[PDB]
Every structure is written in structure tokens, then in C-alpha cells.
């Protein structure tokens, strides 16, 4: 308890220091060469710093589209959080800046690809392999929640696999500092907790629900609630019924029934013992939490890539201009970025 307590207290101290005085305008666009679009309010591009030669993933957001999609506060949230957190399984923000048209967040490039692609290629992960990844998310959420941060977009698409086979969580677009509840409708349909769908004020229990969805999808190859159209998914989510493939262990089913509890007041991670109801569950009996945190556990696989500039594990997107207008757009809205 004291080892963890003092760790988290220091982690919060250091977060709050950066949080109170965010960094701003720490590079500019022409410091980088554009290489390739890695994903698509904006997109993520692989770039190369012209002086150091280091590769980064540059998230580019169109200010005007951010305004129209009502994402102003969310983009400010994302940048402020990324520049203030520090944890082994969180993508590292190196620079941020803005110009007349766009907002830029420049992160260390993780060349191994998204867990999503690997999971669809292999079909499903074994339970040990799912558990290895799950354990990192548990520790990451323990860290974030102790900072009064909610994440709100857990899914394999946002979990990058790094050079050692470990996770780096990316995309903090929906993350937010919350000491009580919050109300915004956001997330991804298959991963939305019932109380989000039902337009309630909700809290960090939604991250533990999403972990339930993630573990199920990793171990089954399919998420627990799916349908042709999102509206049909939502009805399944709120129904309170989930079926498990027969190959799931009894321990896994028991953990998932407790994470995928529709009643947020009964959901693991949100009970009196918090995250320890999850960490102490039989399904994690073999998990060495410290060895995971120290990255001393052999990973299920090391992604195949040729070097720090290799884009092989990402797919191919239409290569569009980075348009920068001659006139400043939305200056007042993003003064603080």
C-alpha cells in the first residue's frame, strides 16, 4: 500500500506542476519533413525532425473543423494532459504548436502499429497475452484516475505496440480532468458504457467498463456487443446480457461479468476497494504488477519493422496537403493551445 501510495502521490505532484503551467509553442512545422500519413477533425502523419533525424507522429487538427465538431475543449484537454503525464504506457508528447489553420501535437513515433491490426491479423489473443496487455491498461488507468483523469476512448485502435511489445496509449482527445461526474456524449459505439448511452452524469467507472470490452475483444476476437448499426449496439449494451465463448476460462468470465456490470455502482474498479478488486482477481493471479511496470516481462510478440522510420505496420491513406491559410483562423478559441 505505501509503495503504491507514495508512487502515486509523487506522480500527482509532478503532473500537477506541469498541469498548472502548460508548455506551449515548442516547435514549428518547417522543423520537420513530412513522410507519410499514418491515420485519419484531422490526421496523424509520420514526420522527421530535420536537425535531429528523429521520427515523430504528428497529429494535425483543423481548427475550423474542431470548432464545428464542438471539440475545442477536448483538443485543449488532450494537449494539456499529454504535456503533463508521464507513465511507461502513455505515448510521449515531444512538441506542440499551432499555425493559422491547424493545431499540432508531435509525439514519439511508435512503429509497431496498433493493437487493432495485430488482433485482426491473428484473430484472437490467448488469455496470457490478453492479460499481459490488460495489466498495462489496469496500471495506466490506476495512474490516470489517481490524477483525477478519465480516458474515455479505450479500444485496440488506440493501443500502439512498441519496439519491446508493450502498449503505448495514444489519442487523449476525450480525456478529461474530472473530480466528480461529467456529461459529454463521446466514445466509440462498441466501447460506450450504458450510462453514457443513457445520457447520465458519469465518472471513471466508464473506463473500467471499457476495459471489460477490451479484454473480451482481445480474448474472443470480437467485442461483446456488436450489430450492423450503432443503434442496435446500444440496445445490446444497455440490456445487461452478455454471452461468453466456451473457450473463456471461468476466471475470465467472472472478471468480465464484474467489469461489464451495467450498474456503475456495482462495477469492478468503482467499488470501495477501487482498482484492487481488479488487481486481486483470480484472472490476474499470475501477473507480476511491478515486473510489468518495469517492462521486465517477455511480451507476446515483438512487432516486425525495419527501423524507426518504417511505416509497414500502418495502412495507406490518401496523401493530402497540409493547408495553412494566409489568415489566422479561430485565434481566440485556441489562444491557450
Amino acid at each position: 500500500q505505501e509503495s503504491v501510495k507514495e508512487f502515486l502521490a509523487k506522480a500527482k505532484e509532478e503532473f500537477l506542476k506541469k498541469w498548472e503551467s502548460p508548455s506551449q509553442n515548442t516547435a514549428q512545422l518547417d522543423h520537420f519533413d513530412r513522410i507519410k500519413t499514418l491515420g485519419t477533425f484531422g490526421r496523424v502523419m509520420l514526420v522527421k525532425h530535420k536537425e535531429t533525424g528523429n521520427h515523430y507522429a504528428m497529429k494535425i487538427l483543423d481548427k475550423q473543423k474542431v470548432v464545428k465538431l464542438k471539440q475545442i475543449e477536448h483538443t485543449l484537454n488532450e494537449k494539456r494532459i499529454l504535456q503533463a503525464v508521464n507513465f511507461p504506457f502513455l505515448v510521449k508528447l515531444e512538441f506542440s504548436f499551432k499555425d493559422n489553420s491547424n493545431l499540432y501535437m508531435v509525439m514519439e513515433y511508435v512503429p509497431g502499429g496498433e493493437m487493432f491490426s495485430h488482433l485482426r491479423r491473428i484473430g484472437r489473443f490467448s488469455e496470457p497475452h490478453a492479460r499481459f496487455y490488460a495489466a498495462q491498461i489496469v496500471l495506466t488507468f490506476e495512474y490516470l484516475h489517481s490524477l483525477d483523469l478519465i480516458y474515455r476512448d479505450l479500444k485496440p485502435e488506440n493501443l500502439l505496440i512498441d519496439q519491446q511489445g508493450y502498449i503505448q496509449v495514444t489519442d487523449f482527445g476525450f480525456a478529461k480532468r474530472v473530480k466528480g461526474r461529467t456529461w459529454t456524449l463521446c466514445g466509440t459505439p462498441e466501447y460506450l458504457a450504458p450510462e453514457i448511452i443513457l445520457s447520465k452524469g458519469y465518472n471513471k467507472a466508464v473506463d473500467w467498463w471499457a476495459l471489460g470490452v477490451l479484454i473480451y475483444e482481445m480474448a474472443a476476437g470480437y467485442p461483446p456487443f456488436f450489430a450492423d448499426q450503432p443503434i442496435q449496439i446500444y440496445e445490446k449494451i444497455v440490456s445487461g446480457k452478455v454471452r461468453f465463448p466456451s473457450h473463456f476460462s471461468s476466471d475470465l468470465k467472472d472478471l468480465l461479468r464484474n467489469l461489464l456490470q451495467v450498474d456503475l455502482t456495482k462495477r469492478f474498479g468503482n467499488l470501495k476497494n477501487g482498482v484492487n478488486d481488479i488487481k486481486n482477481h483470480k484472472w490476474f493471479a499470475t501477473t507480476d504488477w511491478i515486473a510489468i511496470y518495469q517492462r521486465k516481462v517477455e511480451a507476446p510478440f515483438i512487432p516486425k519493422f525495419k527501423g524507426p522510420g518504417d511505416t509497414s505496420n500502418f495502412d495507406d491513406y490518401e496523401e493530402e496537403e497540409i493547408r495553412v491559410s494566409i489568415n489566422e483562423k479561430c485565434g481566440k478559441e485556441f489562444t491557450e493551445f
Partner: peptide, 16 residues
């Protein structure tokens, strides 16, 4: 179950 997931079509990257 897994075949029904494939049948949904929603096996690609999911947007927010």
C-alpha cells in the same frame, strides 16, 4: 459469435 461479428461488417477501425 465470431462469425456473426464478421457478418456485422464492423471489423475495421472504429471511429469515435
Amino acid at each position: 459469435t465470431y462469425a456473426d461479428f464478421i457478418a456485422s461488417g464492423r471489423t475495421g477501425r472504429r471511429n469515435a
